[PDB]
Design a protein around this ligand. Structure first.
Ligand SMILES: CCNC(=O)c1noc(-c2cc(C(C)C)c(O)cc2O)c1-c1ccc(CN2CCOCC2)cc1
Length: 211
């Protein structure tokens, strides 16, 4: 249960400051990128299953589920993707991201839009447009379950998950929404965003509504 504290790569910290401290209007594009990242993770496990199906034993259902928690003020995006290993959390959210993170700001200096963040493979960091803190719970078939957490203060912590709920396989991403942005926890707002930005994705998008 030991927590290892790591620091963001310099370009990622530099980019993370550009997302938080700059004012943008349609911050709703974060959900498009988090669903798209969930869809890409779902693609990788079907392709792994085509090679070896024993990979779906962890969880046979492939879906994308959104769980807004108004009382906790969190938006959770759970998908049964291939998941990430402890190594992958550092090497997929870093190093591979460095070329894209730099290329994004090189495009942003050329006058690009914040919505193009997905074309540079760093669409996850757009979640900090609406989230003050992000808890990424992941589980890959060949590794253990880990909780990645960061408030974009230049440091991120990876914790081996031993007391949280089992995922089996996939990635559960808990976004701690800023108080002025609780609109992204409303039922109607989430759905009109999903239909607007993620209409044509192959996997089923699920929303947990509570009455
Ligand atoms: C290495 C094999 N495993 C995975 O790729 C994986 N499993 O779960 C992933 C999710 C990641 C995120 C954020 C933290 C990146 C989500 O919001 C949702 C996921 O399912 C997730 C993932 C999916 C896509 C990406 C970014 N891609 C896409 C753009 O190019 C770079 C790589 C990064 C991570």
């Amino acid at each position: 249960m030991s927590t290892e504290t790591f620091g963001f790569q310099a370009e990622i910290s530099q980019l993370l400051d550009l997302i938080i401290n700059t004012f943008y209007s349609n911050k709703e594009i974060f959900l498009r990128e988090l669903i798209s990242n969930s869809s890409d993770a779902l693609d990788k496990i079907r392709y792994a299953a085509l090679t070896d199906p024993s990979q779906l034993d962890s969880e046979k259902d492939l879906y994308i589920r959104i769980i807004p928690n108004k009382e906790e003020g969190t938006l959770t995006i759970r998908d049964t993707g291939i998941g990430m290993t402890k190594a992958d959390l550092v090497n997929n959210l870093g190093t591979i991201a460095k070329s894209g993170t730099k290329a994004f700001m090189e495009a942003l200096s050329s006058g690009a839009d914040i919505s193009m963040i997905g074309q540079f493979g760093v669409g996850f960091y757009s979640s900090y447009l609406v989230a003050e803190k992000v808890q990424v719970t992941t589980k890959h078939n060949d590794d253990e379950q880990y909780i990645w957490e960061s408030a974009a203060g230049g440091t991120f912590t990876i914790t081996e998950d031993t007391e949280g709920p089992r995922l089996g396989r996939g990635t559960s991403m808990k976004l701690f929404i800023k108080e002025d942005l609780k609109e992204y926890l409303e039922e109607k707002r989430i759905r009109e965003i999903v239909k607007k930005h993620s209409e044509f994705i192959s996997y089923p998008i699920q929303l947990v509504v509570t009455k």
